[PDB]
Tab-separated table of N, CA and C in Angstrom:
chain	number	residue	atom	x	y	z
A	1	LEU	N	-15.404	2.486	21.309
A	1	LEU	CA	-15.411	2.003	19.928
A	1	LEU	C	-16.539	2.618	19.108
A	2	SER	N	-17.684	2.920	19.727
A	2	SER	CA	-18.746	3.594	18.987
A	2	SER	C	-18.307	4.990	18.564
A	3	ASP	N	-17.645	5.716	19.467
A	3	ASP	CA	-17.115	7.033	19.120
A	3	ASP	C	-16.124	6.931	17.966
A	4	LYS	N	-15.201	5.965	18.046
A	4	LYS	CA	-14.220	5.794	16.976
A	4	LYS	C	-14.900	5.475	15.648
A	5	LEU	N	-15.916	4.608	15.676
A	5	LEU	CA	-16.608	4.232	14.448
A	5	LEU	C	-17.336	5.424	13.841
A	6	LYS	N	-17.983	6.241	14.676
A	6	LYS	CA	-18.663	7.425	14.158
A	6	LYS	C	-17.668	8.412	13.559
A	7	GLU	N	-16.515	8.587	14.213
A	7	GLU	CA	-15.481	9.456	13.662
A	7	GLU	C	-15.020	8.957	12.299
A	8	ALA	N	-14.804	7.645	12.176
A	8	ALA	CA	-14.386	7.078	10.898
A	8	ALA	C	-15.457	7.278	9.833
A	9	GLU	N	-16.728	7.109	10.210
A	9	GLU	CA	-17.810	7.287	9.248
A	9	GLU	C	-17.858	8.717	8.727
A	10	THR	N	-17.712	9.704	9.618
A	10	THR	CA	-17.673	11.093	9.158
A	10	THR	C	-16.463	11.345	8.264
A	11	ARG	N	-15.295	10.845	8.671
A	11	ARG	CA	-14.076	11.036	7.890
A	11	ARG	C	-14.248	10.520	6.466
A	12	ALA	N	-14.738	9.286	6.324
A	12	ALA	CA	-14.930	8.740	4.985
A	12	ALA	C	-16.036	9.461	4.225
A	13	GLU	N	-17.138	9.837	4.883
A	13	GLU	CA	-18.154	10.614	4.175
A	13	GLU	C	-17.546	11.870	3.559
A	14	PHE	N	-16.663	12.534	4.311
A	14	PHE	CA	-15.975	13.716	3.800
A	14	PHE	C	-15.077	13.358	2.624
A	15	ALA	N	-14.304	12.281	2.764
A	15	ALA	CA	-13.369	11.908	1.708
A	15	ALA	C	-14.108	11.507	0.435
A	16	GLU	N	-15.250	10.820	0.591
A	16	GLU	CA	-16.064	10.387	-0.553
A	16	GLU	C	-16.640	11.579	-1.277
A	17	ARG	N	-17.186	12.532	-0.533
A	17	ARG	CA	-17.684	13.754	-1.157
A	17	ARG	C	-16.564	14.480	-1.893
A	18	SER	N	-15.375	14.532	-1.284
A	18	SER	CA	-14.224	15.125	-1.956
A	18	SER	C	-13.901	14.380	-3.246
A	19	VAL	N	-13.965	13.046	-3.212
A	19	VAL	CA	-13.717	12.239	-4.405
A	19	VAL	C	-14.671	12.640	-5.519
A	20	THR	N	-15.966	12.701	-5.202
A	20	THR	CA	-16.956	12.986	-6.236
A	20	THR	C	-16.762	14.386	-6.810
A	21	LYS	N	-16.510	15.371	-5.942
A	21	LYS	CA	-16.317	16.734	-6.430
A	21	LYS	C	-15.048	16.856	-7.267
A	22	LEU	N	-13.967	16.188	-6.855
A	22	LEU	CA	-12.731	16.242	-7.627
A	22	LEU	C	-12.887	15.564	-8.980
A	23	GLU	N	-13.603	14.437	-9.035
A	23	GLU	CA	-13.831	13.785	-10.322
A	23	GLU	C	-14.674	14.659	-11.243
A	24	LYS	N	-15.712	15.301	-10.699
A	24	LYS	CA	-16.517	16.203	-11.518
A	24	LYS	C	-15.681	17.365	-12.039
A	25	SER	N	-14.835	17.939	-11.180
A	25	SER	CA	-13.979	19.040	-11.606
A	25	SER	C	-12.974	18.589	-12.659
A	26	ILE	N	-12.442	17.372	-12.520
A	26	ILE	CA	-11.520	16.838	-13.520
A	26	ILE	C	-12.213	16.697	-14.869
A	27	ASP	N	-13.429	16.147	-14.868
A	27	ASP	CA	-14.179	16.021	-16.116
A	27	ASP	C	-14.427	17.386	-16.750
A	28	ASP	N	-14.847	18.360	-15.937
A	28	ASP	CA	-15.107	19.698	-16.460
A	28	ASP	C	-13.845	20.330	-17.037
A	29	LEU	N	-12.718	20.199	-16.333
A	29	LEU	CA	-11.474	20.800	-16.804
A	29	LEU	C	-10.996	20.143	-18.091
A	30	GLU	N	-11.160	18.824	-18.211
A	30	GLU	CA	-10.818	18.166	-19.466
A	30	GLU	C	-11.691	18.677	-20.604
A	31	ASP	N	-13.000	18.805	-20.360
A	31	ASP	CA	-13.887	19.366	-21.376
A	31	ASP	C	-13.418	20.747	-21.824
A	32	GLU	N	-13.096	21.625	-20.867
A	32	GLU	CA	-12.657	22.974	-21.224
A	32	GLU	C	-11.356	22.938	-22.014
A	33	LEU	N	-10.375	22.170	-21.530
A	33	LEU	CA	-9.082	22.106	-22.199
A	33	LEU	C	-9.232	21.651	-23.642
A	34	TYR	N	-9.955	20.554	-23.868
A	34	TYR	CA	-10.012	20.043	-25.231
A	34	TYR	C	-10.947	20.851	-26.125
A	35	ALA	N	-11.964	21.519	-25.566
A	35	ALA	CA	-12.719	22.480	-26.365
A	35	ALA	C	-11.831	23.630	-26.822
A	36	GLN	N	-10.995	24.144	-25.918
A	36	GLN	CA	-10.060	25.204	-26.279
A	36	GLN	C	-9.062	24.724	-27.332
A	37	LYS	N	-8.569	23.489	-27.189
A	37	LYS	CA	-7.669	22.924	-28.192
A	37	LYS	C	-8.358	22.841	-29.549
A	38	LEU	N	-9.632	22.437	-29.552
A	38	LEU	CA	-10.398	22.376	-30.791
A	38	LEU	C	-10.523	23.756	-31.420
A	39	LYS	N	-10.774	24.783	-30.603
A	39	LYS	CA	-10.878	26.139	-31.141
A	39	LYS	C	-9.548	26.594	-31.735
A	40	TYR	N	-8.442	26.277	-31.056
A	40	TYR	CA	-7.118	26.611	-31.577
A	40	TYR	C	-6.890	25.947	-32.929
A	41	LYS	N	-7.229	24.664	-33.037
A	41	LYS	CA	-6.991	23.963	-34.293
A	41	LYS	C	-7.951	24.436	-35.382
A	42	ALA	N	-9.153	24.878	-35.003
A	42	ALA	CA	-10.071	25.449	-35.984
A	42	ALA	C	-9.541	26.765	-36.545
A	43	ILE	N	-9.025	27.650	-35.685
A	43	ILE	CA	-8.453	28.877	-36.236
A	43	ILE	C	-7.194	28.548	-37.029
A	44	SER	N	-6.512	27.453	-36.679
A	44	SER	CA	-5.400	26.983	-37.500
A	44	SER	C	-5.877	26.603	-38.899
A	45	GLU	N	-7.014	25.909	-38.990
A	45	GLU	CA	-7.554	25.554	-40.302
A	45	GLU	C	-7.989	26.795	-41.068
A	46	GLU	N	-8.465	27.811	-40.345
A	46	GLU	CA	-8.799	29.066	-41.004
A	46	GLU	C	-7.541	29.685	-41.595
A	47	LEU	N	-6.446	29.689	-40.826
A	47	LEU	CA	-5.188	30.214	-41.348
A	47	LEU	C	-4.708	29.405	-42.544
A	48	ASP	N	-4.971	28.095	-42.540
A	48	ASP	CA	-4.603	27.249	-43.674
A	48	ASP	C	-5.313	27.713	-44.937
A	49	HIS	N	-6.627	27.920	-44.840
A	49	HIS	CA	-7.393	28.353	-46.008
A	49	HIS	C	-6.971	29.758	-46.432
A	50	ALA	N	-6.705	30.627	-45.452
A	50	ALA	CA	-6.294	31.997	-45.739
A	50	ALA	C	-4.973	32.011	-46.496
A	51	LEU	N	-4.002	31.214	-46.040
A	51	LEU	CA	-2.716	31.146	-46.725
A	51	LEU	C	-2.880	30.533	-48.105
A	52	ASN	N	-3.761	29.544	-48.247
A	52	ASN	CA	-3.955	28.948	-49.565
A	52	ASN	C	-4.455	29.993	-50.557
A	53	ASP	N	-5.467	30.774	-50.170
A	53	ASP	CA	-5.939	31.836	-51.061
A	53	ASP	C	-4.876	32.917	-51.271
A	54	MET	N	-4.103	33.230	-50.227
A	54	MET	CA	-3.039	34.219	-50.371
A	54	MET	C	-1.969	33.743	-51.345
A	55	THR	N	-1.679	32.442	-51.357
A	55	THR	CA	-0.777	31.927	-52.377
A	55	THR	C	-1.452	31.986	-53.735
A	56	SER	N	-2.770	31.767	-53.754
A	56	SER	CA	-3.540	31.826	-54.987
A	56	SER	C	-3.504	33.221	-55.591
A	57	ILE	N	-3.104	34.224	-54.809
A	57	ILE	CA	-2.974	35.587	-55.329
A	57	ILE	C	-1.999	35.589	-56.504
B	1	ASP	N	21.149	41.915	-63.509
B	1	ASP	CA	21.646	40.897	-62.586
B	1	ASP	C	20.870	40.861	-61.279
B	2	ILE	N	20.646	42.042	-60.702
B	2	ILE	CA	19.935	42.116	-59.431
B	2	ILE	C	18.481	41.677	-59.597
B	3	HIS	N	17.810	42.141	-60.656
B	3	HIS	CA	16.405	41.793	-60.850
B	3	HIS	C	16.212	40.298	-61.064
B	4	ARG	N	17.074	39.683	-61.878
B	4	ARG	CA	16.961	38.248	-62.109
B	4	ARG	C	17.142	37.482	-60.810
B	5	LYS	N	18.087	37.923	-59.986
B	5	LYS	CA	18.303	37.274	-58.702
B	5	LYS	C	17.039	37.389	-57.873
B	6	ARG	N	16.467	38.588	-57.813
B	6	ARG	CA	15.265	38.810	-57.016
B	6	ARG	C	14.136	37.868	-57.430
B	7	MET	N	13.915	37.696	-58.740
B	7	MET	CA	12.869	36.756	-59.155
B	7	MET	C	13.222	35.312	-58.807
B	8	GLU	N	14.462	34.891	-59.073
B	8	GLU	CA	14.855	33.518	-58.755
B	8	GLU	C	14.610	33.206	-57.282
B	9	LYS	N	15.100	34.082	-56.403
B	9	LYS	CA	14.933	33.892	-54.967
B	9	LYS	C	13.467	33.924	-54.572
B	10	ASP	N	12.682	34.835	-55.149
B	10	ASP	CA	11.284	34.917	-54.753
B	10	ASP	C	10.551	33.633	-55.109
B	11	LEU	N	10.802	33.092	-56.302
B	11	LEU	CA	10.145	31.850	-56.704
B	11	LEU	C	10.557	30.683	-55.806
B	12	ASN	N	11.868	30.476	-55.627
B	12	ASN	CA	12.283	29.301	-54.861
B	12	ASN	C	11.918	29.439	-53.387
B	13	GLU	N	11.959	30.661	-52.850
B	13	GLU	CA	11.543	30.854	-51.472
B	13	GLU	C	10.048	30.613	-51.337
B	14	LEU	N	9.254	31.010	-52.340
B	14	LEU	CA	7.815	30.790	-52.251
B	14	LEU	C	7.523	29.299	-52.205
B	15	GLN	N	8.244	28.522	-53.019
B	15	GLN	CA	8.052	27.074	-52.994
B	15	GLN	C	8.437	26.490	-51.637
B	16	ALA	N	9.551	26.957	-51.060
B	16	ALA	CA	9.942	26.461	-49.740
B	16	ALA	C	8.902	26.821	-48.683
B	17	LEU	N	8.358	28.037	-48.756
B	17	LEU	CA	7.353	28.490	-47.796
B	17	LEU	C	6.090	27.647	-47.881
B	18	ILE	N	5.651	27.343	-49.104
B	18	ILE	CA	4.471	26.503	-49.266
B	18	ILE	C	4.731	25.113	-48.700
B	19	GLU	N	5.928	24.564	-48.934
B	19	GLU	CA	6.225	23.250	-48.370
B	19	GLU	C	6.227	23.298	-46.843
B	20	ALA	N	6.777	24.372	-46.268
B	20	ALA	CA	6.817	24.503	-44.814
B	20	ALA	C	5.411	24.584	-44.233
B	21	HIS	N	4.530	25.356	-44.877
B	21	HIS	CA	3.164	25.432	-44.377
B	21	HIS	C	2.468	24.087	-44.500
B	22	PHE	N	2.696	23.359	-45.598
B	22	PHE	CA	2.081	22.039	-45.701
B	22	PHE	C	2.569	21.124	-44.583
B	23	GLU	N	3.849	21.231	-44.214
B	23	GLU	CA	4.370	20.408	-43.123
B	23	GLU	C	3.693	20.764	-41.803
B	24	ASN	N	3.458	22.060	-41.582
B	24	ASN	CA	2.754	22.478	-40.374
B	24	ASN	C	1.305	22.010	-40.403
B	25	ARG	N	0.670	22.085	-41.571
B	25	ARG	CA	-0.727	21.690	-41.700
B	25	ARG	C	-0.897	20.200	-41.445
B	26	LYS	N	-0.028	19.369	-42.029
B	26	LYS	CA	-0.097	17.932	-41.771
B	26	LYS	C	0.149	17.620	-40.296
B	27	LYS	N	1.093	18.323	-39.654
B	27	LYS	CA	1.286	18.097	-38.223
B	27	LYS	C	0.023	18.462	-37.446
B	28	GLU	N	-0.621	19.569	-37.825
B	28	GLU	CA	-1.875	19.954	-37.185
B	28	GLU	C	-2.953	18.902	-37.418
B	29	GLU	N	-2.992	18.322	-38.620
B	29	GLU	CA	-3.970	17.278	-38.916
B	29	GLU	C	-3.760	16.071	-38.011
B	30	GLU	N	-2.499	15.676	-37.821
B	30	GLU	CA	-2.208	14.552	-36.938
B	30	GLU	C	-2.620	14.876	-35.508
B	31	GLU	N	-2.405	16.127	-35.085
B	31	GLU	CA	-2.843	16.523	-33.751
B	31	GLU	C	-4.365	16.522	-33.645
B	32	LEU	N	-5.062	16.895	-34.721
B	32	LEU	CA	-6.522	16.848	-34.716
B	32	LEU	C	-7.026	15.418	-34.580
B	33	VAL	N	-6.402	14.486	-35.305
B	33	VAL	CA	-6.813	13.088	-35.209
B	33	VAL	C	-6.585	12.580	-33.792
B	34	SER	N	-5.413	12.885	-33.229
B	34	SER	CA	-5.136	12.470	-31.859
B	34	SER	C	-6.101	13.124	-30.877
B	35	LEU	N	-6.516	14.365	-31.156
B	35	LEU	CA	-7.491	15.045	-30.311
B	35	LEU	C	-8.835	14.334	-30.315
B	36	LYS	N	-9.321	13.939	-31.496
B	36	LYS	CA	-10.578	13.196	-31.526
B	36	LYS	C	-10.444	11.854	-30.816
B	37	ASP	N	-9.335	11.144	-31.057
B	37	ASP	CA	-9.110	9.869	-30.379
B	37	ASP	C	-9.106	10.049	-28.868
B	38	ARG	N	-8.523	11.150	-28.396
B	38	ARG	CA	-8.508	11.392	-26.966
B	38	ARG	C	-9.898	11.751	-26.474
B	39	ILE	N	-10.711	12.408	-27.302
B	39	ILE	CA	-12.074	12.707	-26.869
B	39	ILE	C	-12.847	11.408	-26.645
B	40	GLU	N	-12.736	10.457	-27.585
B	40	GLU	CA	-13.432	9.180	-27.395
B	40	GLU	C	-12.887	8.412	-26.193
B	41	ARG	N	-11.566	8.425	-25.988
B	41	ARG	CA	-11.068	7.632	-24.868
B	41	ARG	C	-11.318	8.320	-23.532
B	42	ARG	N	-11.388	9.655	-23.494
B	42	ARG	CA	-11.839	10.322	-22.278
B	42	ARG	C	-13.292	9.978	-21.983
B	43	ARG	N	-14.125	9.878	-23.025
B	43	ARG	CA	-15.493	9.406	-22.824
B	43	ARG	C	-15.493	8.023	-22.181
B	44	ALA	N	-14.668	7.119	-22.713
B	44	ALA	CA	-14.580	5.773	-22.148
B	44	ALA	C	-14.069	5.805	-20.709
B	45	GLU	N	-13.113	6.691	-20.419
B	45	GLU	CA	-12.570	6.795	-19.067
B	45	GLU	C	-13.615	7.328	-18.095
B	46	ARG	N	-14.448	8.267	-18.542
B	46	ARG	CA	-15.524	8.769	-17.696
B	46	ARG	C	-16.557	7.681	-17.437
B	47	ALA	N	-16.852	6.867	-18.452
B	47	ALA	CA	-17.736	5.724	-18.246
B	47	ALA	C	-17.152	4.768	-17.207
B	48	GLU	N	-15.854	4.479	-17.316
B	48	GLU	CA	-15.214	3.605	-16.337
B	48	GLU	C	-15.261	4.216	-14.941
B	49	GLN	N	-15.066	5.533	-14.841
B	49	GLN	CA	-15.106	6.201	-13.544
B	49	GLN	C	-16.498	6.150	-12.923
B	50	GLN	N	-17.547	6.385	-13.716
B	50	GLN	CA	-18.897	6.293	-13.164
B	50	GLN	C	-19.230	4.860	-12.760
B	51	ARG	N	-18.746	3.869	-13.516
B	51	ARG	CA	-18.968	2.482	-13.109
B	51	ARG	C	-18.232	2.169	-11.810
B	52	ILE	N	-17.025	2.714	-11.645
B	52	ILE	CA	-16.275	2.499	-10.413
B	52	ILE	C	-16.979	3.185	-9.249
B	53	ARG	N	-17.588	4.346	-9.504
B	53	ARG	CA	-18.338	5.028	-8.455
B	53	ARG	C	-19.567	4.222	-8.062
B	54	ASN	N	-20.230	3.601	-9.039
B	54	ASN	CA	-21.364	2.741	-8.715
B	54	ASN	C	-20.915	1.555	-7.872
B	55	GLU	N	-19.783	0.944	-8.234
B	55	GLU	CA	-19.266	-0.172	-7.445
B	55	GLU	C	-18.947	0.276	-6.025
B	56	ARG	N	-18.378	1.474	-5.882
B	56	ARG	CA	-18.075	1.983	-4.551
B	56	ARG	C	-19.354	2.241	-3.768
B	57	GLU	N	-20.407	2.716	-4.438
B	57	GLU	CA	-21.671	2.918	-3.738
B	57	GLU	C	-22.232	1.592	-3.242
B	58	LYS	N	-22.118	0.535	-4.053
B	58	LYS	CA	-22.556	-0.777	-3.580
B	58	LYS	C	-21.742	-1.217	-2.369
B	59	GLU	N	-20.419	-1.040	-2.426
B	59	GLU	CA	-19.577	-1.400	-1.287
B	59	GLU	C	-19.981	-0.629	-0.034
B	60	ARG	N	-20.304	0.658	-0.189
B	60	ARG	CA	-20.725	1.470	0.949
B	60	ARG	C	-22.053	0.983	1.512
B	61	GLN	N	-22.972	0.571	0.635
B	61	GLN	CA	-24.255	0.045	1.095
B	61	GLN	C	-24.094	-1.296	1.801
B	62	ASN	N	-23.117	-2.103	1.387
B	62	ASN	CA	-22.919	-3.422	1.978
B	62	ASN	C	-22.396	-3.371	3.409
B	63	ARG	N	-21.992	-2.206	3.907
B	63	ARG	CA	-21.446	-2.116	5.260
B	63	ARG	C	-21.827	-0.802	5.937
C	1	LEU	N	-18.169	-4.737	16.974
C	1	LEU	CA	-17.776	-3.347	16.769
C	1	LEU	C	-16.321	-3.238	16.335
C	2	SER	N	-15.450	-4.104	16.855
C	2	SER	CA	-14.062	-4.109	16.403
C	2	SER	C	-13.976	-4.451	14.921
C	3	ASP	N	-14.719	-5.477	14.494
C	3	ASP	CA	-14.735	-5.833	13.076
C	3	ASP	C	-15.234	-4.669	12.224
C	4	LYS	N	-16.337	-4.045	12.650
C	4	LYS	CA	-16.897	-2.925	11.900
C	4	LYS	C	-15.920	-1.757	11.833
C	5	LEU	N	-15.235	-1.468	12.943
C	5	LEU	CA	-14.261	-0.383	12.963
C	5	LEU	C	-13.105	-0.659	12.012
C	6	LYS	N	-12.615	-1.902	11.982
C	6	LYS	CA	-11.536	-2.232	11.054
C	6	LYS	C	-11.981	-2.048	9.607
C	7	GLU	N	-13.187	-2.525	9.277
C	7	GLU	CA	-13.710	-2.324	7.926
C	7	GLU	C	-13.819	-0.839	7.597
C	8	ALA	N	-14.311	-0.049	8.555
C	8	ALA	CA	-14.480	1.383	8.345
C	8	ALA	C	-13.144	2.065	8.105
C	9	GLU	N	-12.116	1.666	8.853
C	9	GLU	CA	-10.796	2.253	8.661
C	9	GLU	C	-10.228	1.892	7.296
C	10	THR	N	-10.419	0.643	6.861
C	10	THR	CA	-9.939	0.254	5.537
C	10	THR	C	-10.606	1.073	4.434
C	11	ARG	N	-11.935	1.211	4.487
C	11	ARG	CA	-12.607	2.012	3.462
C	11	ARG	C	-12.221	3.490	3.538
C	12	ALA	N	-12.030	4.031	4.745
C	12	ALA	CA	-11.605	5.424	4.853
C	12	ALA	C	-10.220	5.629	4.244
C	13	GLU	N	-9.305	4.681	4.470
C	13	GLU	CA	-7.982	4.765	3.856
C	13	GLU	C	-8.070	4.679	2.337
C	14	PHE	N	-8.943	3.806	1.828
C	14	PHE	CA	-9.167	3.734	0.386
C	14	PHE	C	-9.616	5.085	-0.161
C	15	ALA	N	-10.580	5.715	0.513
C	15	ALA	CA	-11.078	7.010	0.054
C	15	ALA	C	-9.989	8.079	0.111
C	16	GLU	N	-9.122	8.018	1.125
C	16	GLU	CA	-8.011	8.966	1.211
C	16	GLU	C	-7.055	8.794	0.033
C	17	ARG	N	-6.708	7.545	-0.280
C	17	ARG	CA	-5.897	7.287	-1.467
C	17	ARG	C	-6.565	7.862	-2.710
C	18	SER	N	-7.881	7.673	-2.826
C	18	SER	CA	-8.612	8.171	-3.986
C	18	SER	C	-8.515	9.691	-4.097
C	19	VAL	N	-8.747	10.409	-2.992
C	19	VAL	CA	-8.700	11.870	-3.061
C	19	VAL	C	-7.297	12.339	-3.425
C	20	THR	N	-6.265	11.670	-2.899
C	20	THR	CA	-4.899	12.064	-3.241
C	20	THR	C	-4.634	11.884	-4.736
C	21	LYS	N	-5.012	10.722	-5.280
C	21	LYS	CA	-4.794	10.471	-6.703
C	21	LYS	C	-5.540	11.489	-7.553
C	22	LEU	N	-6.776	11.812	-7.168
C	22	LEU	CA	-7.547	12.786	-7.930
C	22	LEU	C	-6.902	14.164	-7.863
C	23	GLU	N	-6.320	14.518	-6.712
C	23	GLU	CA	-5.640	15.804	-6.606
C	23	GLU	C	-4.436	15.887	-7.541
C	24	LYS	N	-3.616	14.829	-7.604
C	24	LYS	CA	-2.540	14.862	-8.600
C	24	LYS	C	-3.090	14.946	-10.022
C	25	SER	N	-4.145	14.183	-10.319
C	25	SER	CA	-4.704	14.198	-11.669
C	25	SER	C	-5.182	15.592	-12.065
C	26	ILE	N	-5.888	16.276	-11.162
C	26	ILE	CA	-6.394	17.604	-11.492
C	26	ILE	C	-5.245	18.598	-11.623
C	27	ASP	N	-4.219	18.489	-10.770
C	27	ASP	CA	-3.077	19.393	-10.899
C	27	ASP	C	-2.386	19.231	-12.251
C	28	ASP	N	-2.244	17.985	-12.716
C	28	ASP	CA	-1.617	17.774	-14.018
C	28	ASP	C	-2.493	18.314	-15.140
C	29	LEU	N	-3.802	18.046	-15.082
C	29	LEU	CA	-4.669	18.521	-16.153
C	29	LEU	C	-4.634	20.041	-16.205
C	30	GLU	N	-4.611	20.680	-15.030
C	30	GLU	CA	-4.598	22.133	-14.973
C	30	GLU	C	-3.329	22.681	-15.602
C	31	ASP	N	-2.183	22.046	-15.330
C	31	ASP	CA	-0.936	22.523	-15.928
C	31	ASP	C	-0.948	22.372	-17.447
C	32	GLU	N	-1.405	21.216	-17.941
C	32	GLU	CA	-1.485	21.025	-19.387
C	32	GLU	C	-2.373	22.084	-20.032
C	33	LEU	N	-3.522	22.374	-19.414
C	33	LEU	CA	-4.404	23.379	-19.991
C	33	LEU	C	-3.796	24.772	-19.906
C	34	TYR	N	-3.034	25.070	-18.846
C	34	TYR	CA	-2.402	26.384	-18.772
C	34	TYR	C	-1.439	26.569	-19.931
C	35	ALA	N	-0.649	25.531	-20.222
C	35	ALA	CA	0.289	25.607	-21.337
C	35	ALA	C	-0.433	25.793	-22.666
C	36	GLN	N	-1.484	25.004	-22.901
C	36	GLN	CA	-2.227	25.142	-24.152
C	36	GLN	C	-2.863	26.526	-24.283
C	37	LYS	N	-3.448	27.043	-23.197
C	37	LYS	CA	-4.091	28.353	-23.248
C	37	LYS	C	-3.073	29.459	-23.500
C	38	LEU	N	-1.875	29.336	-22.919
C	38	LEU	CA	-0.816	30.294	-23.218
C	38	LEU	C	-0.439	30.233	-24.691
C	39	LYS	N	-0.352	29.020	-25.242
C	39	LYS	CA	-0.090	28.862	-26.671
C	39	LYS	C	-1.145	29.590	-27.497
C	40	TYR	N	-2.418	29.385	-27.157
C	40	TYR	CA	-3.511	30.023	-27.891
C	40	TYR	C	-3.416	31.544	-27.812
C	41	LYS	N	-3.149	32.078	-26.617
C	41	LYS	CA	-3.043	33.529	-26.472
C	41	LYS	C	-1.881	34.075	-27.294
C	42	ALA	N	-0.755	33.357	-27.315
C	42	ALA	CA	0.379	33.788	-28.128
C	42	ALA	C	0.004	33.787	-29.604
C	43	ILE	N	-0.712	32.749	-30.039
C	43	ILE	CA	-1.165	32.652	-31.425
C	43	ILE	C	-2.040	33.849	-31.778
C	44	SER	N	-2.962	34.202	-30.881
C	44	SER	CA	-3.851	35.337	-31.125
C	44	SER	C	-3.075	36.648	-31.214
C	45	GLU	N	-2.133	36.872	-30.293
C	45	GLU	CA	-1.375	38.122	-30.324
C	45	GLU	C	-0.526	38.217	-31.588
C	46	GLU	N	0.095	37.106	-31.992
C	46	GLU	CA	0.869	37.108	-33.226
C	46	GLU	C	-0.026	37.345	-34.437
C	47	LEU	N	-1.248	36.806	-34.413
C	47	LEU	CA	-2.187	37.060	-35.500
C	47	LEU	C	-2.563	38.534	-35.566
C	48	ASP	N	-2.744	39.172	-34.405
C	48	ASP	CA	-3.035	40.605	-34.390
C	48	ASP	C	-1.869	41.394	-34.979
C	49	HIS	N	-0.640	40.984	-34.645
C	49	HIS	CA	0.540	41.636	-35.207
C	49	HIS	C	0.574	41.465	-36.717
C	50	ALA	N	0.239	40.263	-37.191
C	50	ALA	CA	0.204	40.021	-38.626
C	50	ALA	C	-0.833	40.911	-39.283
C	51	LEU	N	-1.997	41.040	-38.652
C	51	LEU	CA	-3.074	41.831	-39.227
C	51	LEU	C	-2.646	43.281	-39.371
C	52	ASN	N	-1.965	43.813	-38.356
C	52	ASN	CA	-1.474	45.178	-38.487
C	52	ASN	C	-0.378	45.266	-39.548
C	53	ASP	N	0.425	44.208	-39.734
C	53	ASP	CA	1.421	44.257	-40.806
C	53	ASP	C	0.767	44.336	-42.184
C	54	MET	N	-0.303	43.560	-42.413
C	54	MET	CA	-0.992	43.656	-43.705
C	54	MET	C	-1.717	44.985	-43.867
C	55	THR	N	-2.279	45.526	-42.788
C	55	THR	CA	-2.916	46.835	-42.892
C	55	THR	C	-1.891	47.934	-43.177
C	56	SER	N	-0.657	47.773	-42.684
C	56	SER	CA	0.419	48.730	-42.949
C	56	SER	C	0.753	48.922	-44.425
C	57	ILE	N	0.311	48.038	-45.311
C	57	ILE	CA	0.634	48.202	-46.727
C	57	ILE	C	-0.179	49.346	-47.327
């Protein structure tokens, strides 16, 4: 039973570390995705102003 | 006849084009608002996740 | 030791469930970002085409 308990402790330590790394990676990927979305919408606003002046021609 | 047609079409098409761009711009605005709302709720979700991690650390310490 | 082993197995199973859920979450976020990034790249290439069309005048 001591061997089994030590095996379980290592298994969960591994799974917990995996949990923390996956959550950090998820947070980072969300940050990247929505920053990129913001950049896309910003260049969209640039196109909006550009078309407005082009109509103003 | 041809020239008058060309001006008529150019004017009415220009008006349609401006309306179409405004429709795209308003849709983009709605997406921008939803984007900010999602930024705040992702912040809240990360707060909930760190609190859940703290609770899990307490559970790990208790045994 | 039997009680401790049972507790350890329960927490290890919890952590396994957690890592699985996080793996699905990251896979979904990655797919959403791939689609958005492809959209952005298409927007950029079309903008380059537009720029050459205006320079063609």
